[PDB]
């Protein structure tokens, strides 16, 4: 399974430098969410640890967001096996 990570409204602005936190302006989270594996392949019956880290900004906030993880069959891997 190919595992990709997406943030609906939680995306970081294109962790964050402390001096340049103004990039968080206009962003719903007012933080930077990141996950250690952005997109990794995974063998069957293999458990993967994913570290979700939040670096918050200067504005107090209460967030109840949703983070999506997309899982697809690894065509490259199965083709390699064949």
């Amino acid at each position: 399974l190919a595992f990709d990570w997406d943030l609906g409204c939680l995306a970081p602005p294109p962790l964050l430098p402390a001096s340049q936190l103004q990039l968080l302006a206009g962003r719903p989270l007012q933080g930077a969410l990141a996950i250690s594996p952005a997109a990794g392949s995974l063998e069957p019956g293999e458990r993967l640890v994913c570290r979700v880290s939040l670096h918050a900004g200067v504005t107090p906030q209460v967030f109840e967001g949703e983070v999506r993880c997309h899982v697809r069959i690894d065509d490259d891997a199965v083709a390699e096996a064949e």
């Binding site: 939680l10 969410l33 918050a56 107090p60």
Partner: protein, 44 residues
């Protein structure tokens, strides 16, 4: 789904907005540093 409370230092010290479910953790984080604050390097 991830839910969290980014709270100011004053609000944390007074426990102004921490939910009762997590007030113990909030008091812990206030009295004894339990959350990291990456300092990086100062501009000046």
């Amino acid at each position: 789904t991830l839910r969290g409370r980014i709270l100011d230092e004053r609000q944390l010290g007074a426990l102004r907005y921490v939910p009762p479910h997590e007030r113990a953790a909030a008091r812990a984080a206030v009295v004894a540093g339990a959350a990291w604050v990456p300092p990086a390097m100062v501009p000046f």
